[PDB]
Structure formats: structure tokens, C-alpha cells
A paper describes a structure:
In this context, we present the structure of a MurT/GatD complex, from the human pathogen S. pneumoniae. The N-terminal region (1–42) of MurT was not visible although its presence was confirmed by mass spectrometry, indicating that this short segment is mobile. The central (43–302) and C-terminal (303–439) domains are characteristic of the Mur ligases. The enzymatic cavity is nestled between the two domains, with a large solvent-accessible area and one side contacting GatD. The most striking difference between the central domain of MurT and those of Mur ligases is the insertion of a cysteine-rich region (187–236) between β6 and β11. The best models include two disulfide bonds, most likely between pairs 205–230 and 208–227, although alternative pairings cannot be ruled out. No electron density was found in the ATP-binding pocket despite crystallization with ATP, or soaking in cryo-protectant solutions containing ATP. Although no glutamine was added for crystallization, this compound could have been trapped while the protein was produced in E. coli; glutamine was thus tentatively placed in the residual density observed in GatD active site. The conserved residues GDCys107, GDHis206, and GDAsp32 are in positions close to the Cys83-His193-Glu195 catalytic triad of the glutaminase of yeast IGP synthase37, identifying them as the probable catalytic residues. Conserved GDArg142 at the extremity of the catalytic cleft opposite GDCys107 appears to interact with the glutamine substrate.
Author numbering:
A (entry chain A): 43 to 93, 104 to 137, 142 to 439
B (entry chain E): 1 to 247
The structure:
Amino acid sequence: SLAKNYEIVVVTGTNGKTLTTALTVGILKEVYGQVLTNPSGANMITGIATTKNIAVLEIDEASLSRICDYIQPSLFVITNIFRDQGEIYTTYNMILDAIRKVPTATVLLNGDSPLFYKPTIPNPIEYFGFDLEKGPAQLAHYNTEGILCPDCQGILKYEHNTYANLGAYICEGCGCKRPDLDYRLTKLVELTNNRSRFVIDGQEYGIQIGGLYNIYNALAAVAIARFLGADSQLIKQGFDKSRAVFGRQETFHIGDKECTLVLIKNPVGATQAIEMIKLAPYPFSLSVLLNANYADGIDTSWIWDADFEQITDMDIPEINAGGVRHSEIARRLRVTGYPAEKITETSNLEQVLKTIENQDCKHAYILATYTAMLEFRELLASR
Amino acid sequence: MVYTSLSSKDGNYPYQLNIAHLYGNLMNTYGDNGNILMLKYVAEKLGAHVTVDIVSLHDDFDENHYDIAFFGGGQDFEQSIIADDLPAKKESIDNYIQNDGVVLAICGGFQLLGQYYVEASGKRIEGLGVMGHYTLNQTNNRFIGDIKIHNEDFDETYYGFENHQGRTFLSDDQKPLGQVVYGNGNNEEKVGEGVHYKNVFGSYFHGPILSRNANLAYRLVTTALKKKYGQDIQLPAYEDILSQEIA
Ligand SMILES: NC(=O)CC[C@H](N)C(=O)O
């Protein structure tokens, strides 16, 4: 009850599947023309999507095992596995159990994660990573999760660290370290608050969004095309056509001001946004809108693990502390050591819009949780 | 190797606090390492230059060097790795505790100061045993919810959110951090929550506990300062320095 007339690539992981998959398609269309994929998300009811040439499927961690009874993929790709609100190692071993069923497949993993290190599967493993200049080993920031060597059980250090627990890891007891990378991002060329340009296996690609976590999505896409023997020149040709999937920056002219609106979900995501806006070449007003609900995370405690302490080193004159949980976020912002006098706790979103409207500074960043952003996206005045 | 995770900028600070962030590397979950950031902040407002050291795996705890010791909650796996390391730190931490050293322990931290704790599966895991309490098994069920307690010795009320499988049972020589007003707290009996030994402050409160309860932040840091610099010292008033953080 299926068509196996297809070399088939499956793409799983906790974060960034749709992008990686959508990007991988656009690239491969410039090589094979017709590339078969599935829209949005998909579990076992992907036969509808399926009804010489190549297919790339976004699969859910859970559903994978089932399917791998039916289809017989050539490439498994795991972008990365992080936890949300002992749950990482079970969903890794869930995907790893599916992959046992298809011993002919190659597995393409994010080499930079320690979680992927000598997987207990017979399949041949291939790794992509940021192969950047190694400095002397340094620990990661103490709130970084998953830093135990997968052999020694001791604490890992980083010859260089991209973000989270990713980079050139090394245990100074076991000796365990990041394995040799098969698809290498060799140089981080540019990286601002708005763009990043980078070199992978000879070619420069760039994305018009910024924030460093997204580069790992591009890398995975490029690494897949390379596994399928695509010319680095054609990879770029189609990369560019399909780079829309990262999306533009969502900036708003508020009369005389230019305010940019940025989503925060979790500590790692928030920190990532903070390290992004740190790179802006101008002064700005920082507004942080914290709501608490299903979509935004029911417990606001997560902001205490986000590295807001970096704002003190930025060029920020005004801060606004808005959203339903305005009171908790203002306290968080204070505890950075940012001038308490300049943090303006703000009951109402209308008042935040106005204090920005009437600020003297010219640019304004607004970091907000999902719903806080939807509410604020009601600028039913002018957008 | 111990390392300095945080420190105050240089400035005119009468006092000097040294904070041991026990296993800050591994016990870092559910926002509870925000408690380190609250001590630092409060201590600076009472004229202390803070120096937070991560004393973690394979390291030694210098019982004579530190003034506050914080011990957060972590993931199950990480916590059982820590459990194996602990006997090296038992004599040190016991001396620290018994010489009236200030401690704030939370969730897994709190559990691990005691005799043992039993994982949800039923695995017994030995703790330091520098304290008398134990924590028992609860298969397929959690004490999740809002919670409010009252410590009759300080006439102080602490609020938080709790979410734990284990059921802690204090010993005869321990008082709880407070009596429950609503919520579960330590165990099925819904009487007591946390612990209060002698400058040890245990709890299962998320929040983190010191953000939500500035009054406990103030107590911990002043209790530490007065122990080091003598009870007679005069510190800025609770309402004067932490006015913005008071409901
Ligand atoms: N994380 C917590 O709040 C408590 C952790 C503790 N190990 C338990 O019994 O669940």
C-alpha cells in the first residue's frame, strides 16, 4: 500500500525540522527537479503526501518506528535533540530503535552535539559541524544542560562552543571529544543582528535573518545535498531561491522610531535572541513582554535561566517591563544590575507602545513571548 | 576544579560574602539557579562583594571559605551521578552545617542533604546523610500545585509553586521551613514543608523561591553576614533596600 520508487531522506529532531526540510527540498529541486515532500507537520498519515528521483520527509520522533516498517530510507538526519517543559535520552533511543530496522541507511548527525557520539547502531555514521578555530578548553556557562562526557560521566569542556552544549567538546579524563566532521562549516564570515554569512565545504551561503542557531539548519540542508553529490554551485543556486523560509525581520516604523519585534520561548531561545541584539551597531530601547499561559510556558521561572545579565554590556538607555507578568520580568531585569531607575514597569501594552512612540532614542527592540507578541501585533493603527 | 562563576564589579563594599554554588554545573534546572542571582543582588544591596564559586564534581568543599552554600534541583540522571560524588564532601559539608553555616537547598539539593531519596521507579539513592530526613517513593503521581507556608519562629510567610514525586519525612530534631497553609508540601500529610535545621533552609519551592520571597533572600544573606561580621552590625532595613520587590 505504498510506492517505494524513491531514494528517500527522513529528517527528525526536536528543533528546526520544517526549515531544514523545506530548505533541503529547494536545494535538491535545482538538481533533481521534482522533489517529493510533505507540508507542515506529519506522523503515519504521510501516504497522502506520497500519493530515478528523490523524496525528503519531515517525520515525528514518535511515529518514526512505525513507519520504518513500511518505508526503507537511504538517509536519516537528526538536526538535534533538546528537552522542553529524563526525557532526551528516551526520544533519542526511540529514533535510534527505528534506525535499527533499516541497517542499509546512513545516519547524518549534528557532530557538534555530545548526544551523538558513537551511536549504538551498526549503520555508517556521518557528521556535520562548525569546524572553527580551536582555542584552549573552556567550560560552558553553568546553566548549560547536557555537559557530561558520554563515556567518563565527567564534565565536558569546549575547544570552541557555538551555542548551548554544541561545539568542539572534550573530556579531559575519558579523552572523548567531537569526532571528525564529514560536512564542515569552516568559517563564520559575517554575523550581525540581521544576517549571517558562512562557509561550508568551499561555498559561501548567507541567510538574511541572523541569530546563530539558524545556521545549523542551513548546514544540515547543505550537508544532505552534499551526501547526494550535489555541486556546491547548485546548492547555492537553490539555497537562495528557498531562503525565504527563514523569513525577514519584522520591523515596524512607529512614526519616527524603527522597532523590531522578536520572539522568546525558552532560556536557550531567549539567550540566543539576547546574543543577537548584542550585535546591533546602534543604541536601542529594550522592551520585554512576559505572558504566562499554554503557549508561552505556564511557569515564568524559565526567564531566570535566560542570560539577561548580558544587557548591562549593551548600549540600552530605556527598558520597559510589560506583559501580563510585568511584575516578575521587571524584577528579573533589575537583578542584572541594570539601572533600576531606567526600568519602567508597565501594566498595559498600549502604554508600552506609547512610551516607545515618545522615546528619544531611535531604534527599539521588543522581546516577547508568543501570545504577548500576537497581542502587540495588534498595531491596528499602522503597520 | 573550583571556579568563580560570578562576582560583583569592583566598588565600595564594607563586607565580603563567598557563595558556594554546589553542583551549579549539573543542578541547573527549572529556573532554580535564579536563586544564586538573587543572593548576589541582595548581598550587594547590604554592602557585600559577592564571589560565587561552582564547587562541583570531583571538587572539594572548603567548609572554612564559604558563607552561603546553595544546592539547586536537577534532572534525575545528573542527580544520581552527583549522588556518587557526595561521600567525598560529607565530612566537609557536615562541619559547615554544624558550625551554623548558611545553606539554601532546593528540590534535589534538599533531598540529597538527607539520608536518602527514592526515585519514582523505586531505586534507592543514598544522600550525604549530613541531615536526618529521608525522601520516599511516589510511583505514577506528583504533588503539583500552588503553595503557601508560614514559619512561626520568624512570623514570616513564604509562597511558591511545588512539583515533586518524592515525599520528604523530617526527623525528630528538625523543624520544617514552615507549616502548610494550602498545598501539599513535604509529603502526603500536608502538615510541614521544607526544613529549617540551623541556618539550613530546605524547600521544594519553585519560583525561584528567592524571587517570589524577597524576605527569605534578606534573611539568608543577613544571617550569613551577621555570623561572619558579628550580630551587632547594622544592615540596611528590609523595607529600605528591597522596596521594589515587596507585595
Ligand atoms: N524537580 C523538583 O521539583 C523535585 C525533584 C525530585 N527529585 C522529585 O522528587 O521529583
